[PDB]
Design a protein around this ligand. Structure first.
Ligand SMILES: [Cl-]
Length: 419
């Protein structure tokens, strides 16, 4: 597939915006595990102005007025801490053309080939040299379009980033911002003095890859949830805990782990509902923390799926305000946060990462020509990472996108359908 860039624009906010040196909390400075660019696919409607680039760029420039930090750049304060200089320098918007068709991407699994739909970022001319958000609209031969989105993690997590992208789509339709962003990350300042109450292994560094996507129907999901009754168990677990448990159990079996091999599952957890007092709605920044259930492979494989679900349940139930405040305090005491590199190491066999986008508004971006037929990660960056996606047809199905070693993938597919 040839992808040609046709035009590139640095889009500035539509009018001047306030200056500010926007402070980053310790969870805006840590690289989140599950940070990823995303891609949306749209089918042509027959409209002659489908994804008109002037309409998209004018709306983007208007959306950057209330979301002005998105238009800013990174810089170091007087103490060397990375902050966002809100200078309105703008967001990169690339228009590209493909000589292939949307159907060339098949089920839209996040292979490295999807990275080609998001602008590449040259993070080697120093922290100020690049935009915090890069966007690419690619026009395909049969009229389909992709939108690729790459946002630098200091700016926002996925929740705040989709707020922006949805708000841009609203403006493209003529609706002003429905929930204005609340911009003040000092609400996540650590205590003074900082005093952790727990160990936080998720921030302690440790002392061929294939990617696929697999659809489970609403009935398969309901059949999985019903397995909580197995072997007399009386505790009900949610669709999410049972599906996440089943993905973990299936990955252990597909990798052929020994009965006494240990496995850590890292689960992205949004702190917005859990912190006290809870953050104002529209909080703009990062609030993702990591839960870490640990189990023996023989127990996960040989006990019913509710055992893996129970471990996930217990681990998420530990993620309360006390735990999240402790995590911020632990980070405050570390000499170097850049050093807390959460990379390829972390999710490799026998460990695993799972993040769910089921409760995120990933299909709400309608720029005037309809909601997307698919939205998902634009390429999965580390082997051992998995994403649970809600259905773009609103039919109660859920898709599991995952990266595994190639010789484990067909086993994983086989075990995922053993429900
Ligand atoms: Cl097409």
């Amino acid at each position: 597939m040839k992808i040609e860039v046709k035009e590139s624009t640095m889009v500035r906010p539509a009018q001047e915006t306030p200056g500010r040196n926007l402070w980053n909390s310790n969870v805006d400075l840590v690289v989140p595990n599950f940070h990823t660019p995303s891609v949306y696919f749209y089918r042509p409607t027959g409209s002659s102005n489908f994804f008109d680039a002037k309409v998209l760029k004018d709306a983007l420039s208007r959306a950057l007025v209330p979301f002005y930090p998105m238009a800013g750049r990174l810089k170091r304060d007087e103490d060397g801490r990375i902050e966002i200089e809100c200078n309105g320098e703008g967001v990169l918007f690339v228009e590209a053309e493909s000589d292939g068709v949307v159907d060339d991407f098949g089920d839209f699994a996040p292979t490295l080939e999807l990275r080609r739909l998001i602008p590449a970022v040259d993070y080697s001319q120093g922290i100020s040299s690049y935009a915090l958000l890069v966007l690419q609209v690619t026009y395909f031969k049969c009229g389909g379009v992709s939108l690729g989105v790459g946002m630098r993690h200091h700016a926002a997590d996925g929740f705040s980033g989709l707020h922006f992208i949805n708000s841009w789509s609203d403006m493209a339709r003529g609706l002003d911002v429905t929930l204005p962003p609340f911009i003040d990350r000092t609400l996540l300042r650590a205590r003074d003095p900082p005093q952790p109450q727990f160990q936080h292994i998720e921030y302690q560094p440790p002392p061929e890859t294939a990617v696929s996507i697999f659809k489970l129907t609403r009935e398969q999901i309901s059949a999985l949830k019903a397995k909580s009754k197995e072997d007399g168990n009386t505790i009900s677990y949610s669709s999410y805990e049972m599906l996440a448990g089943h993905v973990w159990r299936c990955a252990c079996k597909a990798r052929g782990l020994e009965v006494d091999q240990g496995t850590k599952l890292y689960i992205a957890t949004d702190g917005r509902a859990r912190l006290r007092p809870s953050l104002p709605p529209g909080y703009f920044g990062n609030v993702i923390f990591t839960a870490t259930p640990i189990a023996i492979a023989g127990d996960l494989e040989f006990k019913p799926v509710w055992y893996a679900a129970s471990k996930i349940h217990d681990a998420l139930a530990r993620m309360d305000n006390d735990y999240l405040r402790s995590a911020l305090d632990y980070l405050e005491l570390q000499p170097d946060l850049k050093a807390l590199v959460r990379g390829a190491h972390t999710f490799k066999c026998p460990n695993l990462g799972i993040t769910s986008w089921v409760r995120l508004p990933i299909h709400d971006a309608d720029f005037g020509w309809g909601r997307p037929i698919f939205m998902g990660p634009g390429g999965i960056a580390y082997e051992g990472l998995s994403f649970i996606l809600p259905s773009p047809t609103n039919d109660g199905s859920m898709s599991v996108a995952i990266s595994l070693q190639g010789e484990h993938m067909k086993l994983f597919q086989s075990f995922l359908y053993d429900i």
